[PDB]
Amino acid sequence: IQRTPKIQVYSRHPAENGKSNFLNCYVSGFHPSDIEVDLLKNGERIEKVEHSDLSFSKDWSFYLLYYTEFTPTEKDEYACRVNHVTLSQPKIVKWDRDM
Amino acid sequence: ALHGGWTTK
Amino acid sequence: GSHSMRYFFTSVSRPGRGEPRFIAVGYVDDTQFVRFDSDAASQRMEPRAPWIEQEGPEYWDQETRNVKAQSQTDRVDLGTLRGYYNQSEAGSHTIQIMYGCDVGSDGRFLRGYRQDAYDGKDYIALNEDLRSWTAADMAAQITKRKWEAAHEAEQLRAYLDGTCVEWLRRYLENGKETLQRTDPPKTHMTHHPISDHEATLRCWALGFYPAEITLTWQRDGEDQTQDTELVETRPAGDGTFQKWAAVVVPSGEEQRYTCHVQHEGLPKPLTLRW
Numbered sequence: 140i141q142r143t144p145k146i147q148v149y150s151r152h153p154a155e156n157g158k159s160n161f162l163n164c165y166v167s168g169f170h171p172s173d174i175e176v177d178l179l180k181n182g183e184r185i186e187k188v189e190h191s192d193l194s195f196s197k198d199w200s201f202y203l204l205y206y207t208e209f210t211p212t213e214k215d216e217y218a219c220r221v222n223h224v225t226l227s228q229p230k231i232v233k234w235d236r237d238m
Numbered sequence: 239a240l241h242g243g244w245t246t247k
Numbered sequence: 248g249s250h251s252m253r254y255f256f257t258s259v260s261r262p263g264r265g266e267p268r269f270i271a272v273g274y275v276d277d278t279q280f281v282r283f284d285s286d287a288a289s290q291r292m293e294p295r296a297p298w299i300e301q302e303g304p305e306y307w308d309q310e311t312r313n314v315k316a317q318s319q320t321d322r323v324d325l326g327t328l329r330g331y332y333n334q335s336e337a338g339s340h341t342i343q344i345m346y347g348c349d350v351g352s353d354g355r356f357l358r359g360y361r362q363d364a365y366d367g368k369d370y371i372a373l374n375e376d377l378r379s380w381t382a383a384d385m386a387a388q389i390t391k392r393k394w395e396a397a398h399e400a401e402q403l404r405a406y407l408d409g410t411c412v413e414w415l416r417r418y419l420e421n422g423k424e425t426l427q428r429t430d431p432p433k434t435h436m437t438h439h440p441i442s443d444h445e446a447t448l449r450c451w452a453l454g455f456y457p458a459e460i461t462l463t464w465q466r467d468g469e470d471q472t473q474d475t476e477l478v479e480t481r482p483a484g485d486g487t488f489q490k491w492a493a494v495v496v497p498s499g500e501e502q503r504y505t506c507h508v509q510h511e512g513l514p515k516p517l518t519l520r521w
Contacts, residue, residue, distance in 0.1 A: 140366070151483045165481045170367040171341055172259055191482075192282045192295075193270045194255050199343055199367045201257075206484050237437055237449060238478070238491065239306075239414040240254060240273070240292075240313040241346065241406045245399045247324040247363075247371075247390040 142200055143225035144169035146232045148218065154211050154236055162209045162234065164219035167202035175222035176205045179231070181215055248429070248511070249357065250276055252415040253347030258321035260329075260340050267325055269318040274347075275418050275426055277458050278486070283314045298422030317344075328365050331386035341366055346373075346403075348411035354419075359407030377404040430456040430487055431512030436519050441495065448521055449493040450506035454483070461509040462492040 145168040151161035162185075166176055172193055178185040191204040209217065218233040253274045260267045266285070271292075273281035280296035287293075292310035294300045321342050329340060346361035361373040369383040371390050378400050382388040394400065419426055432455035439447040450462055458480050464471045477492045496504050501521040508517040 142367070145479060147478060147481055149481065149489070151485060161484050163484055167479055171339065172257060192272050192279065192284065193257055194272050195257065195343055199364045204482055204484065237439060239410065240310050240317070241403070242313045242316070243399070243402045243406065244316055244320040245394055245397050246320060247327050247393070
């Protein structure tokens with residue numbers, strides 16, 4: 140009845156520190172639609188984050204894309220924090236260069 | 239364009 | 248090739264917190280071009296692709312009124328279906344609707360569709376013949392009798408194989424510089440040791456449009472249906488899509504594994520080996 144979200148953290152283009160890129164957190168396969176997604180830099184919430192308009196797949200599960208412009212730094216840590224009714228505590232998925 | 243016909247369920 | 252126009256609707260009841268949240272999205276293929284959010288400031292159908300902005304104020308007045316009537320219709324249905332399933336007024340529930348039409352490369356009608364859901368499960372659906380309905384349970388059968396008597400299928404068919412095809416043809420013409428391109432996948436493989444004796448071979452596919460794709464890992468002819476991690480296709484945020492698949496192989500045996508990529512923009516299925 141309630142489906143837990145599937146979280147993927149990735150970049151739009153191959154990462155290159157010093158060069159502007161896009162940080163994506165793709166959340167899919169969840170139901171109901173109410174969800175909390177925040178992009179984190181070194182643990183703190185990135186304030187200017189945009190998201191796509193709610194849509195759903197053939198199985199009626201929802202998907203959303205949260206994104207923000209970031210200039211990656213190999214010392215800076217980036218992650219995605221997702222909270223949903225199917226989760227007892229907010230889940231944090233960190234960005235890995237090879238996902 | 240959007241459809242303009244609505245019958246209640 | 249083939250093309251599609253689909254509209255997606257979501258209505259989520261907010262018990263004791265205001266009117267239900269209503270979000271509508273229009274797509275041509277995998278490209279959003281219109282949107283409506285009941286919590287947004289404009290309270291109008293808004294453009295989301297460059298080629299739709301040339302439509303005049305009468306177009307945006309018509310789409311705004313129609314998308315709001317769909318929202319009001321879902322408000323009634325949220326309360327009605329809550330009674331069908333003997334549910335309390337205290338819970339939040341969801342109605343999801345999708346309809347649209349497909350055309351070929353010559354612009355000819357291929358198929359039309361409409362499917363409705365309640366709380367993430369099938370409720371009622373229009374059959375391919377665009378004349379008969381299929382209800383998922385006995386509660387949805389009540390709606391089916393109400394729609395059969397009102398002859399809703401006939402009026403909906405006139406849109407699905409008529410008006411829907413008409414506008415899709417116009418959109419494909421107005422956006423022929425951006426809607427008629429298929430980008431092939433850029434492919435590469437990576438190797439990540441997990442220990443002194445095993446490694447993760449990951450097969451990559453980037454920048455492909457449309458989103459449909461197939462990645463399979465083979466090992467000496469046999470296909471590793473299992474022992475294979477395959478993530479869901481994901482958007483890059485620029486119009487293209489990404490997907491990878493990985494297998495954990497024994498160190499020194501990477502040459503016995505093969506990745507295979509199948510996309511419409513590829514003249515032959517790509518075969519990759521580490």
